[model samples]
Target: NSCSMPLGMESKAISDAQITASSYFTNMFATWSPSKARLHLQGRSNAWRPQVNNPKEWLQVDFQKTMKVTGVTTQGVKSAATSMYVKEFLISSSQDGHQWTLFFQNGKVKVFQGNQDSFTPVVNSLDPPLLTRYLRIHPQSWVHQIALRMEVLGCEAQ
Candidate 1:
């Protein structure tokens, strides 16, 4: 039986346990772990920055609760030290963990345009939002060492 979790939850604020990445990096504060990847929340040292500058790094998020996911919001953010943001991205997600074979809704993991300037928010909508659970945002190209504060938008009943 399909679960009806869309009773009152529209846009859920993801907790620390819900967000993860292939790897993370930081210099100041030497913040143990969580502080470096909480997405545009908390204090200044909070954006998720990967340890390396390669396309292999990915920011993964598992909502744990299914909802009608519509789109995602991302923005380039940081102090004057660096110009960081995702320039190219390819998104892949699993609906309620139903399938995980790694397939893109587009032809083959199509590349999506991303932010080019710091502080300018960019929005990418799913042509037809799916009931998503586990989603992965892969940075195809970037400036500096791939930094981003992502906000996923989930909606009411599917």
Candidate 2:
């Protein structure tokens, strides 16, 4: 399955955005660095893996410019098993990065499930899109260690 943009719309280029994480592993096999989070945005198969294994850990992406965010896609580390995928996560957006707000609608928190199948991304659409400069993902729970490759879809603010 693919999460292509509709008709005239296109996927935003988020590769230059700054990426930050709670913590990262330092092994040679897979050094979990914030930069790795943008691998999927580079049209490659790299992924980001956090060293700290906890619910409080999170990953944030700063687009550096306002964007009309329409959706998000997350994939598990291809080298790991299915249990390594993020099971539940909260999506939030902000204009200043300090004052974050949960991206929810109809009183329900917009928590999305990660893909259990490695390399295959699970796309979650955001209804009534959000215009913001920063997007953060808080992984509340996961089957195993928190590992992911992500992509945000939208257009630059007009």
Candidate 3:
């Protein structure tokens, strides 16, 4: 698996984004692949602040492969937040990371809350084409900056 970060973390107060170069860590950290990669976040102490009440952030990881991908899925794990909210999530492919075309968008899916995990099947309009080594996920909005985990799975090659 290849690690490709699309955009670093951005605070709403600043136009320029900042990334914590150090590895991600938190008391609430959970991982499916401890050897591979993991992420962690601590919620704000203030409950009254809207930004604390609903912290938002976006990040994308790339899976480098030339094989055909039929679908992608995510697994949600235990965290401080009882409910996780995503305003939008999208899957885009690029021959080069500079240019992109959307392959999947979360807005069209049946939205719901589940305790354990969830799988959303992707429908492809074109037969699985030869994809480049980079895949992007654009998540427009999310609540609870530090309490969500995702696992992506791709279907077999054609």
Candidate 4:
């Protein structure tokens, strides 16, 4: 059965997910986690936009119902000497979304060189009875028009 999910259920259905956004002269972004999903505006060429400046651009995903967030990876976030960058990568969780605890942080801007894609692995415990649901990935630095790719993976209960 391959019925289409009601416009926004695809990410929820998959245990592991990877999504990509591209721009010819714009920027395309998607924010999601087990609890929420949001698509950010793609930047237009004529205008220079800063995503970090917008709080709406930042999103949180909650997996309190399921304890399976094991890893996160990113690729295709490269710029050609144009200073494409990510200021920090953060993984936050909460039993309730209002109060959040920082799980992971890159601490400083992590830079990837050349036109080639790069991957960074984030690993964590997936033991059950874990009451965390909100997860957030944020980029603090960027330049020009470039694609942002994100991947979320986890362990399946036996």
Q: Give the best candidate by TM-score.
A: 2
lDDT of 3 by residue, 66-157 (tens): 43443333322233444443334445566655886666334453222312321122222223332543444344444443222333334323
Error of 2 at 153 (Å): 0.5
Between candidates 1 and 4, the lDDT winner: 1
Off by over 4 Å in 4: 1-57, 77-87, 104-131, 143-147, 156-158
* Each model's lDDT: 0.66, 0.68, 0.32, 0.35
By TM-score, the better pick of 2 and 3 is: 2
Sorting all predicted structures by TM-score, with the top scorer first, yields: 2, 1, 4, 3
Which is superior by TM-score, 2 or 4?
A: 2
- Candidate 2 global Cα RMSD: 4.4
Candidate 1, residues 123-154: lDDT per residue as tens digits?
A: 77765565667778888888876877777665
TM-score of model 3 (CA atoms): 0.41
Error of 4 at 90 (Å): 2.0
Residues 1-158, candidate 4, lDDT per residue (tens digit)? 12111212224353323212111222354332212221221222212123334322333444435434554443323333343323334345566657876553345422323123222322223222223555555443434332333334553322
TM-score of each predicted structure versus truth: 0.78, 0.80, 0.41, 0.42
Q: Where does model 1 exceed 4 Å of error?
A: 1-12, 32-42, 96-98, 101-108
Q: Cα deviation in Å at residue 28, candidate 4?
A: 13
Steric clashes per prediction: 0, 0, 0, 7
Against the true structure, candidate 1 has what lDDT?
0.66
- Using lDDT, give the best candidate's number: 2
Q: How far does residue 5 in candidate 1 sit from its true spot (Å)?
A: 16
Off by over 4 Å in 3: 1-57, 85-87, 104-130, 141-148, 155-158
